[PDB]
Amino acid sequence: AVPYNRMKLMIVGNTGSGKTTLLQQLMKQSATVGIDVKDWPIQIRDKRKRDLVLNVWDFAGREEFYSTHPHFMTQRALYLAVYDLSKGQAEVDAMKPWLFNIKARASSSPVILVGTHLDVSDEKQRKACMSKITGFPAIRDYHFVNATEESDALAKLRKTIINESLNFKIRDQLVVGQLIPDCYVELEKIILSERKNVPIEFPVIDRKRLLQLVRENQLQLDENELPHAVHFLNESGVLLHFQDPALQLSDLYFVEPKWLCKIMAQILTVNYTQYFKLYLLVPSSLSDHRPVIELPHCENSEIIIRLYEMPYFPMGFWSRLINRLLEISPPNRRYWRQGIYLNWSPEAYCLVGSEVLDNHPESFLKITVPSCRKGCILLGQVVDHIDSLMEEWFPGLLLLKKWALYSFNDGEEHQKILLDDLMKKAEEGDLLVNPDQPRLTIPISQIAPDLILADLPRNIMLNNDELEFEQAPEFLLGDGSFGSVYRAAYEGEEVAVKIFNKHTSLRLLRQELVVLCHLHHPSLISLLAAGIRPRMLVMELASKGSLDRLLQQDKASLTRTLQHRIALHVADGLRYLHSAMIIYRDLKPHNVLLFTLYPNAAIIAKIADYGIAQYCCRMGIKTSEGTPGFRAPEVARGNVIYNQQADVYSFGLLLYDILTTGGRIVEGLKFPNEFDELEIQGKLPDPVKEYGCAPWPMVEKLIKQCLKENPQERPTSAQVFDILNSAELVCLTRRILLPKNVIVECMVATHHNSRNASIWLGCGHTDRGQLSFLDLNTEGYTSEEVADSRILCLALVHLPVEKESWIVSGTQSGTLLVINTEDGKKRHTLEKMTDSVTCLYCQKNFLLVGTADGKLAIFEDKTVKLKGAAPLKILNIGNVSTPLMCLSESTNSTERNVMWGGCGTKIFSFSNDFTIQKLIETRTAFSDSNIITVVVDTALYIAKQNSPVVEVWDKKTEKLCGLIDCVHFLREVTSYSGRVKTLCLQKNTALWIGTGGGHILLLDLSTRRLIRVIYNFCNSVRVMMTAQLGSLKNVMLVLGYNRKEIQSCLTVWDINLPHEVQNLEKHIEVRKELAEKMRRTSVE
Ligand SMILES: Nc1nc2c(ncn2[C@@H]2O[C@H](COP(=O)(O)OP(=O)(O)O)[C@@H](O)[C@H]2O)c(=O)[nH]1
C-alpha cells in the first residue's frame, strides 16, 4: 500500500519552438530525432510529499514524427505545450491542430501551456488570441517565460501535479498517491534490474521468462492476475506491453521504451522489426510538395468533384488513408505524402489529396473523377473507403461536413451545396433545379452518384412497377435492428424485400450494398435489386426458413449429415468473405438461412443480413459490435483492436449450438447474463455430458481448437474449412480411451443386443490372462484376470436352444475356457486340446477352434452345458510347423458349407462332410511366412504377416490373378511399416485393409482403384471386425495402438465410408464450378 508517485509529463512541443531547451534549463541539441525519454525526480517543500518522479517524454515536431507519434500519447499523463512568441499568434494557429490532437487522443489529461523566448516576446500581439482560444482541451494555465535564463515562475509542474491527486484522478482514484501493494513494486524493481542483461540492440523478452523469474523470485504473481499487473505497469510508463491482437505482439514483451521510440531514424536512414505497424510502410520518406501533375479533363463540367471539410487533420490520418487506398484490385501511381493519384487511363483516375487554398484556416480533402461511368464507380468506391476509415479509427471527426461542387452553367466557377440537404433534394425527386433559370437543370447522376445508387452495375436496378407487396404486417420475418424483411413477389418469384426503418443513414444501406453487390458465391445470399425511393433491398427468399426455428422446432429433420452441411457451407461463405478483406462479426444461429432439407443437395446454407460487415485490412478494426453471447472474446473489452480471427470464434459458437441441437440458445433465451457469462471464455461445458446428444469426436477436437483465448492459436478460415472437407470427420460415431499399461489383441462383440454393445477385450499383457468387459453407452472398464496364460482368441455363440449365450475363450497354454454371458460365475472349462489355441469362429452351429499344432478342433453347439468334452473328432490337417490361425466364414450366397480357411502356409476348405474338398499350397519371396485371414467375396484375398503385398487366389481356377501392393499405394503419403496386420471385408462395396503403420486403407473392389487413405490418428491397427450397435447395423471397430506409453484407443467407424468419400467429393466438385461461374460474372 505504498504511494507510488510516477506519471508521464510528455512535453509535446511543435518543432523549432524550443521544446527541449526549456526542460534543459528546467532540470539542470540540434534536432531531437523521435521521442527522447529522460528521467526527472521531485522533492517538494513539504517533505511528507513523497518523491514525484516523472518520466518526461520530449517529443519532436518534424512531420514524419508527427505521423509516427500518436500511439504513445496514453492516459495518466500531465501534458504541456510550447510555442514561440516572436512569430506571435501564427505559432498559436500552428499549435491549434496539435491541441485538437491532444483533446482527441487523451481526454482525462490536463494540458498546461507555456510560451518561450521572453527576450523577443511581443505578448501584446498574441495575448488577445491566446485569451480567445479557450474541441480544445481544458487549458489550465499560461506562463509565457524565457528559455535559457529561468527567472520566471518555474517548477510549477510540481505544484500542479502533487496537488492534482484528486484534481487529476483516473476515475476518482489516486494517481500520485496510489497505495499500490508490494507485489507491483517488486515486479517493477526486478524488471528495472533485468533491463541490463537483455541485449541492447533489440531488447525483448518472452512471457515464459517473466513467469520463470517471478517464480524464481517468489513474486507471488498469480497467472490470473499477472496480465492486469503488467497492464498497470505498462500504463505507468516503464514498459510497453502491446497486447493488441491485430499486431500479434501478445507474446513478445518489451523492457526498454527508450528503444522502441528511436527506431524511426534507423528505418528512414536510407529481423523477425518487419512488423512496423506504426506494401511498404515508411511514410517518413514521402515528399511533401504539390507534384507536377495536371488533369487530362480540365474544365468545369466534364469532371465530378467531391469535398470534405475537416477541422484538424488527425495525427496519423494520411498514413492510414494511403495504406488503405493502396488496394489496387477493384495503375501508374504517383503518391506523395498526402495526395495519391491513382491513374489508369485518360478515362478513369481518382486524384485524392488535400487543398488549403480556401482563403480560410480550414483543411479541405477533395476527390476528382472524370464524369463518365467508370469514374462514378471509382468515386463511389473511394467515398465508401474513406468513410469506413474515418468511422473506425478516428470517430472524433463524426464536426465533419460534406460538400458537393456542382455547376449550373458550364465554363464558370462552381457553387457549393452540402449533402445533408442534397439527400432530401434527391430523395424527393430527381433533376435538381436551377433557381435562377428553371430551364437549366443538371442530373444527380453526374454531381454525386453516391446518393442515387448509380455506382452499382446496371443489372441490379429496381423495377418498382412489378413489386406488388403490401406493407401489411401479416407478411413478417426477422427484424435485424435496422429493417424488417417481409415476403414479396418480384416480376413473378418469391423475394424477401427488406424495407429499411423510418430514418436510417444511407451509410448503412451502402455498408450492406458494398458487400452484397461485389462478391458473389453459392454460399452468400445474392441481391436481385436495390432501389432508393423507399430505400429498400430485395433478396432471394430462402424457402426453408432461418436456422434458429429449425433447431427449436424441427429436431427430427436434423440428421448427422445435415449438421455437417450447415457447418460446411457456412465455412465456405466465411472463407470467401475473409479472402476479400471483409469481416462479418455477426455469425449467430439466427443468421444462417436454409434452402433445402434433403441431405445431398448442393446449396443448403446462405448467410444473410450483412448489417455490420466492415472492411478489414491487415491493420484491423477498433470498434466493438455484435450481439451478447455470440461475440468474440476480445470484442467485449472494446479497447483492444482485432482482425479477421474474431470471427472464427463466432463459428465455434455456432458449431457448439449445432452440436447441442439447440440447448444452449434455448436455455439462455431466459437470462442474457447466462449467455454473457462465457462472453470471454471459461464457462462452456463438454457437450455429451448434459444435453444428451450423441458423440462426434472429430468435431469436439476442433470445437476446442477454435475456441481459445490467444488470437493466434485459433485456425485461419482456410484451415478451418480444410478440416471439414474430409469424410474422415462425418463418419465416426465414438472414440473411447483405455487405461495406461494395458494392450489389446483380441476382441468379440455381442450382436444379441443385451445392452446393444457389451464389447469384451481379451488381453495377455501380464503372464495371467485378463478378460475386460467394456460397455459402450456407459464406458465401464470392469476388467477381470481369470486366465493363467495369454488370451489369443475369443468367440461368441448365442445358442438358440433354450435361448442361451455363452462366450468362449482360448489360452496360449492350450485351454478351452467358457463363461456364461448372463451368469457371471460359470467357469465350465472344457477338454484342453493337445496344443495351444490359435483361433476360433462360429443350421449347423459348431465352434471351429484352431490350434497351433495344425489340427482342426471342432465342438458341438449343444455341448456348451457340459463340463469337459471333446464332442467331435479332431482333424489333424497339418504338421507341428503349420500354425492353424486363419479361420473365416463364407459370404457368397451365405453358403456356410463352403467355409474357407487355410492351414499354415497353405489354403484348404471343407463342408459339413468335413472332408478337404480342395487344398492349394501358397508356395508361390515373402513365402517364408504364415497366413492370417482369408475372405471370400468373389475370390480369396489372403493376407500374411510382415507383407507389403496381399495375394488374390480364386476359388474356381485356383491360380493367382493380381498382387495388390500396399506400400506401393502408400508410396505417396509422406523403411516403412506397410505390413497388413488385419484384413476385413465389407458386404458388397470394398476392402478394408488395416496396416500396422497406423493407416486404414479403404481399397476398392473394381480392379485396384484406391478411394482414399486414413492416417494421422493412430500408430497401428491390431484387430478389426464388424459388429452391430444400438439395434442398428453398420459399424466397423478398429483397435489403434499408441507406440513409450501404450494407449489402445477403440474407435467406431460407420461402414458407409466409401460412398461418403465419393458423394462428398462429387458435391464439393459440383459447387466449385458454380463458385467460379457466378464469380466470373462480377469481373465481366
Ligand atoms: N536564439 C535562441 N535560440 C534558442 C532559444 N531556445 C532554444 N533555442 C535553439 O533551439 C534549438 C532547440 O530546438 P529543438 O527544441 O530541439 O527543436 P525540436 O527537436 O523540433 O523540438 C537549440 O539548438 C537552440 O539553439 C532562445 O531562447 N533563443
Ligand SMILES: CNc1nc(Nc2cn(C(C)(C)C#N)nc2C)ncc1C(F)(F)F
Ligand atoms: C433473414 N431473412 C430472410 N429469411 C428468409 N427465409 C425465411 C422463410 N421463412 C418462412 C418460415 C416464413 C417461410 N417460408 N422464415 C424465414 C426466416 N429468406 C430470406 C431472408 C432475407 F432476405 F431477409 F435474407
